[PDB]
């Protein structure tokens, strides 16, 4: 059994919806981080709000599942740095349900902390952003933008995730990248010739390549064979069934592969209310209709927004005489999707679209 299936189904549906807002530009997010945060919100939801969140998050034992998956993601390894941490910041004068606070700590280890939103909201925002910055080793410095919290803010539920790994085999830093039918942009390429898992997903007309990090985390890249990015078919037809078949432990066949991928860095910020609403999570965001009585007996809360910020920096860092070129090539000189997979849990930690150097 794939123990991360709900989260993966959500990750893919979320990507499809986000792509409606952003169909062609670079995209990057951590579906894991979002699922975790939303799970903590779900714990406080009731009535129709709850029923819709369960549908959207693909839950149709959830909390014990997150705790177990989180434990596996956080396991000490020696091979890379990988940390996922949740946090709850609550208005100091507010009275939340004792069982909500207890259960959120039990299953999410969110170390519930009081802050002063009512009178010092800007100070509270700075503190929250500083906490995330620390957790992300400086990589996500200002998660919550100006105006995101105010005197009516009652609780901010946070997840931070951080990953730093080295490739099992280092690349060599070696050029035109095809952005669309009217644009080519020079990019620094990285080259590797190594025994790697490579296949082809006919239903998506795309090559898939696995690049392992040291340890049980890998990057999978999906590269299509339109006059825009070339990703229309792949993005519209990708599903859990089609993808999981190919990311599964032993489907693919290892071969000597010559790989060229760009060296790249992405940094993207999102506000997900519109997206989550479109996916079916309406009542949570409806000031009138939301039911978060699980958080507060007074039933006086609603979800105002969900902020997400994610970054990635891909480089050559890892742990002669060959001249033939008869075998597989994977030349990522045009737009591709990629994902960073925790192999033990089968959870997607990060997912993106690289289309514009």
């Amino acid at each position: 059994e794939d123990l991360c299936v709900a989260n993966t189904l959500f990750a893919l549906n979320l990507f499809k919806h986000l792509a409606k807002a952003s169909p062609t530009q670079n995209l990057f997010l951590s579906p894991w981080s979002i699922s975790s945060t939303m799970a903590m919100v779900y714990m406080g939801s009731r009535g129709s709000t709850e029923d819709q969140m369960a549908k959207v998050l693909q839950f149709n034992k959830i909390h014990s599942s997150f705790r177990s998956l989180s434990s596996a993601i956080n396991a000490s390894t020696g091979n890379y740095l990988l940390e996922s941490v949740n946090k709850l910041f609550g208005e100091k004068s507010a009275s939340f349900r004792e069982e909500y606070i207890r259960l959120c700590q039990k299953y999410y280890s969110s170390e519930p902390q009081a802050v002063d939103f009512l009178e010092c909201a800007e100070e509270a925002r700075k503190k929250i952003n500083s906490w995330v910055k620390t957790q992300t080793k400086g990589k996500i410095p200002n998660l919550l933008p100006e105006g995101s919290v105010d005197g009516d803010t009652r609780m901010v539920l946070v997840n931070a995730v951080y990953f730093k790994g080295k490739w099992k085999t280092p690349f060599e830093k070696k050029y035109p990248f095809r952005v669309n039918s009217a644009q080519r942009t020079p990019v620094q390429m990285m080259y590797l010739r190594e025994k790697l898992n490579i296949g082809y997903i006919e239903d998506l007309k795309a090559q898939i390549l696995e690049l392992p990090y040291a340890g049980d985390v890998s990057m999978f890249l999906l590269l299509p064979d339109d006059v825009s990015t070339g990703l229309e078919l792949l993005e519209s037809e990708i599903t859990y069934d089609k993808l999981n078949k190919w990311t599964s432990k032993d489907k693919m066949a290892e071969d000597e592969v010559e790989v060229y991928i760009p060296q790249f860095k992405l940094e993207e910020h999102y506000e997900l209310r519109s997206i989550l609403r479109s996916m079916g999570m309406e009542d949570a965001f409806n000031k009138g209709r939301a039911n978060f009585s699980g958080m507060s007996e007074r039933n006086d809360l609603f979800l105002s927004e969900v902020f997400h910020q994610a970054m990635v920096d891909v480089n050559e860092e890892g742990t002669t005489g060959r001249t033939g070129h008869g075998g597989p090539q994977f030349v990522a000189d045009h737009p591709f999707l990629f994902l960073i997979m925790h192999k033990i849990t089968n959870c997607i930690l990060f997912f993106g679209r690289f289309s514009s150097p």
């Binding site: 992300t136 998660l143 009516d152 901010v156 539920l157 958080m295 480089n315």
Partner: peptide, 14 residues
């Protein structure tokens, strides 16, 4: 690869 992310869900009073 170095990768990181944050998510923040804001609950507001009404």
């Amino acid at each position: 690869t170095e990768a990181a992310a944050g998510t923040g869900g804001v609950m507001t009073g009404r």
